[PDB]
Amino acid sequence: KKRVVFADSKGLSLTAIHVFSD
Amino acid sequence: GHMGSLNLDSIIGRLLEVQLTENEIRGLCLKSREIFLSQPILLELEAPLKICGDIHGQYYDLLRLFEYGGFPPESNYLFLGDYVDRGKQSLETICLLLAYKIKYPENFFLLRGNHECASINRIYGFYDECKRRYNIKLWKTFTDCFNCLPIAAIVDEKIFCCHGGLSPDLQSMEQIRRIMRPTDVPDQGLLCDLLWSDPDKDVQGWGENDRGVSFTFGAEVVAKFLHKHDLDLICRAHQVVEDGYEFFAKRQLVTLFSAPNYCGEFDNAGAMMSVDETLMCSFQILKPAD
Ligand SMILES: [Mn+2]
Ligand SMILES: [Mn+2]
């Protein structure tokens, strides 16, 4: 049975940032 | 079969090159309406999934969202509402979303936001855009479609998703399932609250919402809701947040908002939440450069 885990609690990046031209 | 058939690949291709007939858009509304009505009003979804917040007619930002998240069917999508109003291209936005819903009805999902009601989008842009580019009858066809959108989703029995938030009337999920469609969004009650309420770090329990409709709810309300229903997370949208996502109540709730530099009044990023098959969650942040 699955459990919600946020990635930074597993030593991974919580976020990825995509900066785009407007 | 009374209106003939759409060429959906043609329609999608023309939308991505950013010019539909009135009958094409009508067909998008009627066919997607039938699909919405064939699926539950409380969706039961499985991960992997990408979850997106408000768009508000910012069509070029929607295209950026698909570019970085993966165009359907490369990723599964759940949008949390507020596709139209305020932005300059509500029609392109909702047409592309309805096209993907028709083409990938089991891998692409749209929830109802408070702007998917005629009482709201009459005033905040969509009615005017329909009238200027097509006609009022088309806007009413959109209203008929919007009145059949699902209103909440549960991902793998652990993530409860809706546009606005909780309701003091929500005791059982069956209460959501018993909401009959088509319906407009009334100015009080369960449906209203699911589309309009906000979390508030200063409120204890429930408070009156400043919008003039619905409520605010505090952190113990969230904790008791997750506890009662054996859930792990509430995922909602509706409020602009600076980073495109924002946690509430020790990460028991998250707000997603996917329209960057929202309606020219904010300098926010947009975000989407990536949920893998184990329900490990991360965020993809869209930041326009200056
Ligand atoms: Mn909103
Ligand atoms: Mn909203």
Residue numbers in the entry:
A (entry chain B): 82 to 103
B (entry chain A): 2 to 19, 29 to 300
The authors write:
Dephosphorylation of both enzymes is exerted by protein phosphatase 1 (PP1), a pleiotropic phosphatase involved in the regulation of cell growth and protein synthesis, other than glycogen metabolism. PP1 is directed to its different pathway-specific substrates by scaffold proteins; PPP1R3 are those orienting PP1 towards GYSs and PYGs. PPP1R3C (317 amino acids), also named protein targeting to glycogen (PTG), is ubiquitously expressed. PTG is composed of 317 amino acids with a structured central region, containing a carbohydrate-binding module 21 (CBM21, residues 133–261), flanked by largely disordered regions.
The PTG N-terminal region contains the PP1-binding signature RVxF (84RVVF87). PP1 was then co-crystallized with the PTG peptide 81–107, encompassing the above signature. The region 83–103 could be easily reconstructed in the electron density map (2.05 Å resolution). It organizes on the PP1 surface as two β-strands, with an intervening 310 helix, pairing the PP1 C-terminal β-strand. In the context of the various intermolecular H-bonds involving the main chain atoms responsible for the β-sheet extension, side chains of the PTG peptide also significantly contribute to the binding. The aliphatic region of Lys83 is in contact with PP1 Leu289, while its terminal amino group forms a salt bridge with PP1 Asp166 side chain and an H-bond with PP1 Glu287 main chain oxygen. PTG Arg84 complements PP1 Asp242 side chain, which also receives an H-bond from the main chain nitrogen of PTG Val85. PTG Val85, Phe87, and Leu95 are almost entirely buried in the PP1 hydrophobic groove constituted by Ile169, Leu243, Tyr255, Phe257, Arg261, Met283, Leu289, and Phe293, all also becoming barely solvent-exposed. Following an almost flat region on the PP1 surface, a second groove accommodates PTG His99, stacking to PP1 Tyr78 and hydrogen bonding to Gln294, and PTG Phe101, sandwiched between PP1 Arg74, Leu296, and Pro298. GCI titrations confirmed that the main PTG binding determinant to PP1 resides in its RVVF region and surrounding residues with a KD = 14 nM for the PTG peptide 81–107.
